[PDB]
Amino acid sequence: GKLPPGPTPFPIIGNILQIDAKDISKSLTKFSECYGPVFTVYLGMKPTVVLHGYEAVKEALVDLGEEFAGRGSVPILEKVSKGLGIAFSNAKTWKEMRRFSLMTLRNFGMGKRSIEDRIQEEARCLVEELRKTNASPCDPTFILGCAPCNVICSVIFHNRFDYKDEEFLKLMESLHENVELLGTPWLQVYNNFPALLDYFPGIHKTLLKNADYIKNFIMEKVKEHQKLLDVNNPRDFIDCFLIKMEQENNLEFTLESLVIAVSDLFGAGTETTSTTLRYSLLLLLKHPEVAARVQEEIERVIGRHRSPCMQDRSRMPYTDAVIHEIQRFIDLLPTNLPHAVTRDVRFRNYFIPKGTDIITSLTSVLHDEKAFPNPKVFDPGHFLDESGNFKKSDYFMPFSAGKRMCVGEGLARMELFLFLTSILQNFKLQSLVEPKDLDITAVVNGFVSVPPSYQLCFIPIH
Ligand code: HEM
Ligand SMILES: O=C(O)Cc1ccccc1Nc1c(Cl)cccc1Cl
C-alpha cells in the first residue's frame, strides 16, 4: 500500500504552485533533495510518481520495464493518434507498431539503399545549401530543420524535397506550429482542466488543421506508393507497411494506422534532431577548441576528399565523445516523455496502482555529478579515457531506456555524426560575438530544451 511521499498538494490544483513554470526539472530536483529518489507530485488531482537519480530511473525503466512500459498522459496529441501509432499508443497496438518500426528502421531494413546512404545524400544537400549562404551571417534554424525532416521523408517516402519546396516547408511549418502549440513539460495538464481549453482554444484549434495537413501530406504519398508497390522489393517504410497489410492477419495495420505511425516518427524525429544539431553548432561556437579538435580528427581519419561514413565513427573517438557530450549536456528532454504503469506494482517499499503517471528525470541521470564530474560543464573528456579512447557510460541516457526507449535512436545518432562531420569538414564556424558573450543556456519550450537564438557564418574550407 501507500504512494511515495511528496509535497503537500493544495486542493484541486495540486503541487502546481510549487513547480517552477520555466524549469520543471529544477523543481523536481529540489523536491528530491527532501523527499528522496522516489516521490509523488500532483499535476491537478491525479498523482504522478517521479523517479530521480540513475538507480530509481534504471530500476523502473529497465528492471521493471514491462510495469513501466505504459505511455502516460499526453492530452490532445494522444487523442489525434486515436490510441494508434507508436508514441502515444499502449498495449498490443503499441507492441505491434513498435516491433514493426524497429524492424523496418534498421540501417538496411528497407532494401539496398541503406538509411546511412539516405543520410549521406542529405548531408551533401545540407553542405550545398550552407554554401549558398555565401559565408554571410545566418540563423541555421531553418536549414538544420530541413535536413532531419528530409531524412525521415527519405526513409518513409523514398523521396527528399528541395529546401525551397512549398509543401515541404509547409510540412515543416505544419509540424513546427503543431509541436509549438502543443508544447508543455507537464503534458498531464490537458487531461485535467477543461475550462482552460476554452480560455485558450488557440493552442488546441489549428492542430486539427495542420496535424491534418501532416496526415494529409502523408496519406497522399501512401496512395502513390500503392500503385508502385513491389512486394519483393520494399524501398521505404510505407512499402514495408503496405506489404504487411497485403499478406497480413494484422488488424492493427490499416491506412489510418500507417498515417498516424508516420506522423509520430516525423513528430518525434524532426524537432529533436533539428534542435540537437542547432545546439551542436552553438556549443562548437562556444568552445572553438572542440570544433578544431574534431576537424583535426576528420582530416586525419576521413580526409578532405570523401564524404564521412558510419565506419569512420569507431575510428573517431574524440568526435564520438563530442556528440555524446552535446546530447548529455543539452539534456533535450529533461523529463523524458511521460510514462505510466501498466499494472499495480510494488516499487521498492511503495505501492503504485495501475495507470499511475510516471515522470523520469533524465536530467538527474545525464547530469549525475559522480558519473560526469562537473556535469554542468561541457567537456568531451566526460567520454574519453586517459589514452584518448572513447569511454561509454551507463548514465548516457538521452534516448531514455527500457521498453519505450527512442525508436529512432540509431537513425538520430547517424544523422548527428554524418551532418556534424560533413559540416566541420567543409566549413569553419564564425560567430558574430566572442565565445565569452555567447549565451548557451537552454530555455525549455514545450518538452524540449532549446538553445538561445544565434547567428553565424559558414566559412568554406578550401
Ligand atoms: C537527437 C534526437 C532524438 C532524441 C534525443 C530522442 C529522444 C527520445 C526520447 C527521450 C524518447 C522517449 C522515451 C520514453 O518514453 O521513455 C523518444 C521516443 C521516441 N522517439 Fe526519439 N529521439 C530522437 C530522435 C528520434 C528520431 C530521429 C525518431 C524517428 C525516426 C524518433 C522516434 C521516436 C519514437 C517513435 C519514440 C516513441 C517510442 C515509444 O513510445 O515506444 N526519435 N525519443
Ligand atoms: O508526436 C508528436 O507529434 C510530437 C510530439 C508532441 C508532443 C510530445 C512529444 C512528441 N514527440 C516526441 C517524442 Cl515521441 C519523443 C521525444 C520528443 C518528442 Cl517532441
UniProtKB/Swiss-Prot annotation:
EC category name: oxidoreductase
Induction (record text): P450 can be induced to high levels in liver and other tissues by various foreign compounds, including drugs, pesticides, and carcinogens.
EC number(s) given by UniProt: 1.14.14.1
Gene Ontology MF terms: heme binding; iron ion binding; oxidoreductase activity, acting on paired donors, with incorporation or reduction of molecular oxygen, reduced flavin or flavoprotein as one donor, and incorporation of one atom of oxygen
Listed GO CC annotations: endoplasmic reticulum membrane
Alphabetical list of PROSITE patterns matching this protein: CYTOCHROME_P450
A Pfam family hit: p450
Binding, heme: C406
Keywords noted in UniProt: Endoplasmic reticulum, Heme, Iron, Membrane, Metal-binding, Microsome, Monooxygenase, Oxidoreductase
InterPro entries, alphabetized: Cyt_P450, Cyt_P450_CS, Cyt_P450_E_grp-I, Cyt_P450_sf, Cytochrome_P450_fam2
Subcellular location as annotated: Endoplasmic reticulum membrane; Microsome membrane
Transmembrane residue ranges: none
Superkingdom of the source species: Eukaryota
GO biological process, alphabetically ordered: organic acid metabolic process; xenobiotic metabolic process
The family this protein is said to belong to: Belongs to the cytochrome P450 family.
Role according to the record: Cytochromes P450 are a group of heme-thiolate monooxygenases. In liver microsomes, this enzyme is involved in an NADPH-dependent electron transport pathway. It oxidizes a variety of structurally unrelated compounds, including steroids, fatty acids, and xenobiotics.
Protein name as annotated: Cytochrome P450 2C5
The species this protein was found in: Oryctolagus cuniculus (Rabbit)
